[PDB]
């Protein structure tokens, strides 16, 4: 929860206007589920490049080709 609440709090406050925007547990849990799978997806796709590169170590090299696309 520690790095998730920080980002949520920073960005609700950053992107508020007259006030921070309440929120529910389902909203917070729904967001947290979504964001986890996004990192799983992009790391895994970049890992597909890793295997294609005849290496076993996911590296910032592999993260960059999916990110460039």
């Amino acid at each position: 929860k520690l790095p998730f609440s920080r980002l949520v709090r920073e960005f609700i406050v950053k992107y508020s206007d007259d006030e921070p925007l309440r929120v529910t547990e389902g909203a917070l849990l729904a967001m947290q589920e979504s964001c986890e799978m996004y990192l799983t997806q992009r790391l895994a796709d970049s890992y597909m490049l890793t295997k294609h590169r005849n290496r076993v170590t996911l590296e910032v090299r592999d993260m960059a080709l999916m990110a460039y696309i």
Binding site: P3, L7, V8, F11, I12, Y15, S16, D17, E19, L21, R22, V23, T24, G26, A27, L28, L29, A30, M31, S34, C35, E36, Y38, L39, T40, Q41, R42, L43, A44, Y47, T50, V56, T57, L58, E59, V60, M63, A67
Partner: protein
Amino acid sequence: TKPAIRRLARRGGVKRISGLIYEETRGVLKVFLENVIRDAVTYTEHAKRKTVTAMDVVYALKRQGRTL
């Protein structure tokens, strides 16, 4: 944390990970989340309501393309 990144890599089938991934992974996500939270916050505040709901998160995800 370091094991949360490890946990995400092992979910994706990644066995071992280099040390820069830790910082790189946080950056990539914030971009995603900035859009999710921004969009959610923007829709939630604009749409006759001031509370983020599960469907507002859903609305933010549709508005991504880093999903498609």
